A paper describes a structure:
The basil EGS and petunia IGS are closely related to a number of other NADPH-dependent enzymes that act on phenylpropanoid-derived substrates. Structurally, the PIP-family proteins organize around an N-terminal, Rossman-fold domain, containing a core, six-stranded parallel β-sheet flanked on each face by an α-helical layer. In summary, a mechanistic scheme emerges in which binding of the coniferyl acetate substrate within the active site of EGS leads to deprotonation of the p-hydroxy group (PUSH) coupled with expulsion of acetate ion from the C1 substituent (PULL).
The monoclinic structure also contains two EGS/NADP+ complexes per asymmetric unit and was refined at 1.6-Å resolution resulting in crystallographic R-factors of 0.210 and 0.229. Intruigingly, in the monoclinic structure of unliganded EGS-NADP+, a nitrate anion from the crystallization medium occupies the site of the bridging water molecule, and may mimic the hydroxide ion that develops during the catalytic reaction. The structures of EGS complexed with NADP+ or NADPH provide the first structural characterization of nicotinamide-cofactor binding by the PIP family of enzymes (previous crystallographic analyses had yielded only apo-enzyme structures). The cofactor is bound through a large number of polar and non-polar interactions. The nicotinamide ring adopts the anti conformation with its B-face stacked against the side chain of Phe154 and its A-face directed towards the substrate-binding pocket. In contrast, the anti-conformer of the nicotinamide ring observed in EGS is consistent with the class-A reductase (donation of the pro-R hydride) activity of the PIP-family enzymes. Detailed inspection of the hydrogen-bonding network involving the ε-amino group of Lys132 suggests that this group exists formally in the unprotonated–NH2 state and is the donor in hydrogen-bond interactions with the 2′-hydroxyl group of the nicotinamide-ribose and the backbone carbonyl oxygen of residue 110. With an available lone pair of electrons, the amino group can serve as the acceptor in a hydrogen bond with the bridging water molecule, and most importantly, thereby act as a general base.
Numbering used by the authors: 5 to 314
The structure:
Amino acid sequence: GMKSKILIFGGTGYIGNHMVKGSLKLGHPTYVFTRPNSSKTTLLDEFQSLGAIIVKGELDEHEKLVELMKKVDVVISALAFPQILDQFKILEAIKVAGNIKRFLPSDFGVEEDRINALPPFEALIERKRMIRRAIEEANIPYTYVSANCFASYFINYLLRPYDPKDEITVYGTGEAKFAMNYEQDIGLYTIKVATDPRALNRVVIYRPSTNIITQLELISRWEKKIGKKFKKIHVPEEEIVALTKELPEPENIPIAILHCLFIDGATMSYDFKENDVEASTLYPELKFTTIDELLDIFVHDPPPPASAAF
Ligand SMILES: NC(=O)c1ccc[n+]([C@@H]2O[C@H](COP(=O)([O-])OP(=O)(O)OC[C@H]3O[C@@H](n4cnc5c(N)ncnc54)[C@H](OP(=O)(O)O)[C@@H]3O)[C@@H](O)[C@H]2O)c1
């Protein structure tokens, strides 16, 4: 019907698949752009059975992108770090088509316009800033989503629930606060804000009050959930900083990110600005899965661990 048509790049991705599923769940005609050689064949079949329109192609096919843009209203990019500046190909097609009502670049993490990080990670978020600056310069309608930490991703990374070990690694003192959200909710909320007038040309942050915690508190709550105590092993901050300077790339990127998220506490080190929009306050019919509900999920049916591409 009146539902905006949504085109998602990187839809077969770790977070992208949740945006595809949320888009379809909300009744939006959904287009998924994917490479001809992608191994996500079974996932594509699932998308297809859910109503998605699969489009195979490369980002280098400018004409194809333009003709595709002319058929949709909203464009969301969930591309990975190595493809951040490749989004300029998406933006060029958007500019040529001229009918796009909203573009969401691949941010979905920290709010890069108000935080800085160590060189390895700073270089990456600067690329995301470059995309943002280009969007504004071209007057393209946008929404910048700061989804903070992907919950399943980091519960797996921090607690290694699938590991029967008696020790757990803590980064820094472990007292830095961070916010983490369930991937499925990040996906649904993202589709929602992409058509919400309240999010037009604004920064949207996912910071539900029920999802703020520290490494130490997360460990304590997990210990209570499973009835086991862990020996906490700390990795000194000065130690983490040194590694980012000596280790080769991309090996030093994960370390820099851990410092930003769990030592500097970048997702919780600022207060909201006047024009910021905190997503959990937008829809009374929805709510973000809480940390306690997440831990229960890991007790009953834990999702597999993942590792971002660098
Ligand atoms: N906040 C957090 O905790 C957190 C954690 C992880 C990631 N992130 C962010 O989430 C966003 C997406 O990350 P992700 O881990 O979901 O991405 P991903 O799964 O690694 O990749 C997304 C998609 O990119 C496409 N792709 C891969 N290589 C490509 C290439 N050479 N050329 C063109 N397309 C290519 C693939 O789709 P096809 O195979 O269909 O072509 C892939 O499924 C990024 O902005 C990332 O920084 C945030």
